[PDB]
Amino acid sequence: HWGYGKHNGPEHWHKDFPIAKGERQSPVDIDTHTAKYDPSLKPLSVSYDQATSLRILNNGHSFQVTFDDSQDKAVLKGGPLDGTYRLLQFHFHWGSLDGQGSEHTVDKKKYAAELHLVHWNTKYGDVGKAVQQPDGLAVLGIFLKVGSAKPGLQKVVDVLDSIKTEGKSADFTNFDPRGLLPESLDYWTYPGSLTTPPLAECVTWIVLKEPISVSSEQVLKFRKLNFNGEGEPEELMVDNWRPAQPLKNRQIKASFK
Ligand SMILES: NS(=O)(=O)c1ccc(NC(=O)Nc2cccc([N+](=O)[O-])c2)cc1
Numbered sequence: 001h002w003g004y005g006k007h008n009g010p011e012h013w014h015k016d017f018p019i020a021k022g023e024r025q026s027p028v029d030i031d032t033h034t035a036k037y038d039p040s041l042k043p044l045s046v047s048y049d050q051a052t053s054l055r056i057l058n059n060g061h062s063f064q065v066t067f068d069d070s071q072d073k074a075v076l077k078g079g080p081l082d083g084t085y086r087l088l089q090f091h092f093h094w095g096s097l098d099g100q101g102s103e104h105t106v107d108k109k110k111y112a113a114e115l116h117l118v119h120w121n122t123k124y125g126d127v128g129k130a131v132q133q134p135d136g137l138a139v140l141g142i143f144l145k146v147g148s149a150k151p152g153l154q155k156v157v158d159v160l161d162s163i164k165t166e167g168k169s170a171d172f173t174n175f176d177p178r179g180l181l182p183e184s185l186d187y188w189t190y191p192g193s194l195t196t197p198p199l200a201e202c203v204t205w206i207v208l209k210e211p212i213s214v215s216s217e218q219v220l221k222f223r224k225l226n227f228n229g230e231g232e233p234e235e236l237m238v239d240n241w242r243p244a245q246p247l248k249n250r251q252i253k254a255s256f257k
């Protein structure tokens with residue numbers, strides 16, 4: 001199956017998922033001088049006070065923290081969005097080196113990592129229905145640069161030893177995702193897709209202008225994870241990012257001036 005190596009990586013995905021070459025693929029480069037300020041964009045409403053985390057999981061492509069989405073507990077609304085989107089999971093994409101690790105780029109600049117907080121539109125009832133809809137998902141993207149540690153990330157870093165290999169999961173209750181957010185909620189937005197197979201074109205992307213800083217020790221522990229499962233030849237989980245895709249007939253809008 002698909003992965004991020006030479007023989008199964010992003011250049012191969014279109015053979016199993018021809019939408020890889022579609023009209024609204026993600027990620028993209030954010031050209032800040034070409035994105036237009038849109039005064040009609042409302043502020044984002046990130047309501048994570050009641051968030052209920054469940055498990056942390058190595059899925060062989062990233063690690064993921066899942067949340068209870070059976071009620072409106074942690075929701076995203078406002079911004080470019082209509083209606084209510086429930087937080088389902090977050091995961092990261094990161095590099096083998098600090099100069100690469102993000103999927104979106106900003107004026108071609110690559111960040112060391114990128115956080116994706118994945119939400120689905122409650123009008124569609126369940127995630128599986130939502131991924132079949134052009135407005136089914138909203139993913140909040142947050143860039144990571146290497147500098148000072150991010151305290152709200154350390155509980156995640158602390159547990160990665162226990163999910164080293166594909167298929168491992170662990171209890172990860174009572175985690176507060178508000179500690180992963182930067183100060184400003186200024187954002188860029190555009191219509192796009194999942195950045196992993198099936199690459200469904202179901203995502204309103206909301207990418208925050210302000211990166212969070214993480215320490216070298218924190219991102220180092222990302223790079224200790226493995227793509228393989230236990231008892232297999234070790235391949236470090238690094239460079240699990242899809243490169244920027246053609247913007248095609250799309251406008252990136254900015255919530256700020
Ligand atoms: N890398 S990304 O563009 O932010 C992305 C987000 C979501 C998916 N797909 C899913 O999350 N599917 C899914 C469907 C049901 C339940 C869960 N989950 O337990 O996290 C996940 C793929 C790529």
Ligand SMILES: [Zn+2]
Binds near residue numbers: 091093116
């Ligand atoms: Zn992602």
